[PDB]
């Protein structure tokens, strides 16, 4: 079965969709639908866009409920929860600190860091869901929400839903470092995804890999760029949004604390760490269950 | 390639789990963990158990936020939204009307009276980083998650499989199923409805699995159209369960409009005089095996 691969730009990075058994006409039509949806998601979420739904909330000083879409509500909810579960390491309110670091020319003082830390905190954000509407609510006017670190994962999940709505049940889709697959590839086998150096089958799941994809990461506790020997983390989770959120959180925590969260939460994770000259690797038991022989 | 098949009781119905290739010690430990988790989900969601998390909320007359678990918040959020998207057909607040029909048939007057104690607009979910809440603006509101509890449990069982390093399985709770990977013959799990492969998806089939009435909230009466059966394939079994109930309540014509609009994978059976006829959405057909 011949596989069509579609590719384009979104959110400062790239997207891909591999779809077996679709003709040229259907391919062109789907590429248009895909790009249209991704552009919409970018318009929903981008901090690089002055007029995005999210930046409109960020510009607002209101402390009352601010209406948002179902997806916005869910992305924030997931981010808030995984934030708590990673001891605040994954923090969508860390924006003020990111800007402080030119995220780069001049290094901020601890005094400047402290001042900006006071404008952040996951405790300041609430999601309100009802049948016909939903809201974000902040209790700090200066709160700044940045969903950069989960936007690729959401986009990939949403691409998967689009495939389903289009009657496409076999696909591998990706946005930046986030991927989702379902069903069989061209050769009637579960989609294979290669990992930074092994191969996994993550059908029915999302996977996210650390790194910079747009054209960075700050420890919310210290208000400084991250350190540690953890050079790469890969998370497999039920959705790519979740995988993205865990991935960033774990990357911030570093090897020792990350493993503690991984163990407690029963996460499927693969880490590459640097030990002097060379590197060592670590996989949770849950991660190994996804490996293909 | 041998398949362990586990089975037990939960939520007034039965759960099932097919797992390829594991020894008896594993099968034994899993059964214990599965039953333990399903028991906890029942303690969370059951309208029978007077002391369930859900019944404690129902028992309260407070109109202020009531703390619940993440699962509870998410189940309710999904239920509220799919309720809206099925024009109120799927309605977790319909309990007062259900109880009314539990003696003698109520009049339309008695029905209209109880309608006043219902409405999806009365329920709010509040999510924060370290806690989350349900909130009702009507003390007498009664929440019943019977129609989604099976789907949630099947999804949660899938999460249990994953946390337990199991990559190939078919789990079911009542009419709700999830599957992943290859069965005891290297082929994707086959689900009889026509047969489908729904690996990586939830599926729910209409019907009674507990040991009652499905009420049309618009009329406040038992449903009485010619939609014999509806099956939904969705990203999760919770969603499938919720859609399935909504579309069953809506009946054939209205259900098809929702299915078209929302792009759902749905299979319907309707009664045409003496014979039946079938209908599949384009999306459902992508799951058919031959
Ligand atoms: N600790 C954090 N938690 C959540 N978001 C963060 C954190 N630190 C930085 N960010 C945001 O995430 C971005 C990095 O996102 P990522 O997708 O990993 O790389 P990039 O966006 O540079 O491709 C930063 O530019 C910043 O907007
Ligand atoms: N329209 C509705 N929306 C949501 N729940 C309903 C509705 N009508 C009835 N219910 C509740 O759902 C139950 C039916 O659930 P279901 O799983 O479809 O069948 P059963 O519980 O009989 O196996 C009823 O007993 C009642 O508690
Ligand atoms: Mg990136
Ligand atoms: Mg990320
Ligand atoms: Mg049932
Ligand atoms: Mg149902």
Numbering used by the authors:
A (entry chain B): 13 to 115, 121 to 214, 224 to 241, 252 to 329
B (entry chain A): 13 to 114, 122 to 212, 224 to 241, 251 to 329
What did the study's authors say about this model?
John Wiley & Sons, LtdAs the Ftp_EcY60N protein variant displays FAD pyrophosphatase activity that is inhibited by ADP, we obtained a crystal structure of the ADP complex with two metals bound. In contrast to the apo structures, there are only two monomers in the asymmetric unit, and the r.m.s.d. of the monomers is 0.4 Å for 289 Cα carbons. The metal ion in site 1 in both monomers is no longer coordinated to a carboxylate oxygen atom from the side chain of D283, and thus has a coordination number of 6. Refinement of the metals as Ca2+ ions resulted in large negative electron density peaks that disappeared when modeled and refined as Mg2+ ions. The side chain of R240 also coordinates to the β‐phosphate of the ADP. The distance between metal sites in this structure is over 6 Å, approximately twice the distance observed in the various Ftp_Tp inhibitor and substrate complexes, and we observed no metal‐coordinated water that can effectively bridge between the bimetal sites.
A high‐resolution structure of the Ftp‐mediated flavinylated protein of Shewanella oneidensis NqrC identified an essential lysine in phosphoester‐threonyl‐FMN bond formation in the posttranslationally modified flavoproteins.
